[PDB]
């Protein structure tokens, strides 16, 4: 089973991943985790990070150019993801394809029903063949939570993506989620 | 030996590659050829081509975003290039790294000594590890018409600077047998 944990930076995804992993293991389920972007492991991810810090000329000014680098980062991990899914009962990804839909739409002042969100789904799931997650868990935070307005808009798109079932089933949870009850909901 | 053929669209690079290959083969040396971008074989190349036709949102509006895709296209061919260079006497590339310097600078309205050109050399040769060509042949002949003119001038500037290695500047009626003899 493939589970994606989603949310804006600072939401607390990492702690939720650890909480859910322990809950899964406590129930007898093996767990592996993988975090995107793979900074320090993917040239596409590293070029993106560097672009965000003002390097590589005007690269960061293109929303779709940045989204493509993150998509290419995941496309190189597809064999890794499949291997984990074959060896572990649950695979939890800290950020996945929906991250591209949320930030790309937010950067372009669009909503989950907009072009950018639909473009991400087409290119990552349809063309590049990335496995669709069985679950996408949105760790939701408020508007008050670098660029503060971008994170707020990204948060709103996230909720819309979840409400629309973008790419599969979603769960909307808060920070202090009940780990045993959540693992039971995800893996019955 | 690694040879790159450079020039603006319509210069006749494809024809020169074919003529030069036969000259090399006629001289008893094996030849393989590879054309960039690898449209239809690289996701980065296809996304770039599609971006140039108005798809993929704002991707084409970024000079460095386009250059990065062409660099990533070549970066995915780096082992392919190395394999061919180890198996054939001559490897001729239709377009290579210098294309990124020329079109990026020309789009930047900057000369070969500008930032983009130095950025292309840095990211493709140093960082991405693309092999430096033994020869870069500029087919010097002259759809945004003003963009192509600037790209041609930057091309000649790159050749004058020895950008990335030795260059040869040739015209339309170049003698392929004499050119193959000069290269090897
Ligand atoms: C996995 C993924 C992630 N993201 C975003 C990319 C932006 N970060 C935030 C971020 C991340 C940044 O760079 C970082 C942040 C932390 C560590 C490193 Cl090494 C680099 C930024 C740097 C400068 C300015 C703003 C920055 N903002 C959140 C996930 C996408 O847009 N699409 C994706 O597919
Ligand atoms: C290999 C390489 C190539 N180029 C350029 C990219 C642009 N083309 C010209 C071109 C190429 C285009 O797209 C094509 C053209 C022909 C075939 C395909 Cl599949 C796509 C264009 C489409 C619309 C409008 C203008 C277009 N211009 C010349 C090589 C670089 O800038 N850097 C590179 O590294
Ligand atoms: Cl977080
Ligand atoms: Cl040509």
Curated annotation (Swiss-Prot), chain A:
Pathway the protein contributes to: Pyrimidine metabolism; dTTP biosynthesis
Alphabetical list of PROSITE patterns matching this protein: THYMIDYLATE_KINASE
Temperature effects on activity: Highly thermostable. Is half-inactivated at 65 degrees Celsius.
Cofactor: Mg(2+)
Activity control summary: Competitively inhibited at the phosphate acceptor site by 3'-azido-3'-deoxythymidine monophosphate (AZT-MP) (in contrast to other TMPKs such as E.coli, in which it is a good substrate). Inhibition seems to result from the impossibility of magnesium binding.
A Gene Ontology term for the protein's cellular component: cytoplasm
Domain of life: Bacteria
Effect of pH on activity: Optimum pH is 7.5-8.5. Inactive below pH 4.6.
An annotated Gene Ontology molecular function: protein homodimerization activity
Catalysed conversion reaction: dTMP + ATP = dTDP + ADP
EC number: 2.7.4.9
GO biological process: dTDP biosynthetic process; dTTP biosynthetic process; dUDP biosynthetic process; TMP metabolic process
Record-listed Mg(2+) binding positions: 9
UniProt family annotation: Belongs to the thymidylate kinase family.
Subunit structure: Homodimer.
Function according to Swiss-Prot or TrEMBL: Catalyzes the reversible phosphorylation of deoxythymidine monophosphate (dTMP) to deoxythymidine diphosphate (dTDP), using ATP as its preferred phosphoryl donor. Situated at the junction of both de novo and salvage pathways of deoxythymidine triphosphate (dTTP) synthesis, is essential for DNA synthesis and cellular growth. Has a broad specificity for nucleoside triphosphates, being highly active with ATP or dATP as phosphate donors, and less active with ITP, GTP, CTP and UTP.
Record's comment describing the protein's domains: The LID domain is a solvent-exposed domain that closes over the site of phosphoryl transfer upon ATP binding.
PANTHER family: THYMIDYLATE KINASE, UMP-CMP KINASE 2, MITOCHONDRIAL
Designated name of the protein: Thymidylate kinase
Lineage start: Bacteria, Bacillati, Actinomycetota, Actinomycetes, Mycobacteriales
Gene designation: tmk
């Amino acid at each position: 089973m493939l589970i994606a944990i989603e949310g804006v930076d600072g939401a607390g995804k990492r702690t939720l991943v650890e909480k859910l992993s322990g809950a899964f293991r406590a129930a007898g389920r093996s767990v592996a985790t993988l975090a995107f972007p793979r900074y320090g492991q993917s040239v596409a991810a590293d070029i993106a990070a560097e672009a965000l810090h003002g390097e590589h000329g005007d690269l960061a000014s293109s929303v779709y150019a940045m989204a493509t680098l993150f998509a290419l980062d995941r496309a190189g991990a597809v064999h890794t993801i499949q291997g984990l899914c074959r060896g572990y009962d649950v695979v939890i990804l800290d950020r996945y394809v929906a991250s591209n839909a949320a930030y790309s739409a937010a950067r372009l002042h669009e909503n989950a029903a907009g072009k950018a969100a639909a473009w991400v789904q087409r290119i990552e799931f349809a063309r590049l063949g990335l496995p669709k997650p069985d679950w996408q868990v949105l760790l939701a935070v408020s508007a008050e939570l670098r660029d503060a307005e971008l994170q707020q808009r990204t948060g709103a798109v996230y909720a819309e993506l979840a409400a629309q079932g973008w790419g599969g089933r979603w769960l909307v949870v808060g920070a202090d989620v009940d780990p045993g009850r959540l693992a039971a909901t995800l893996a019955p």
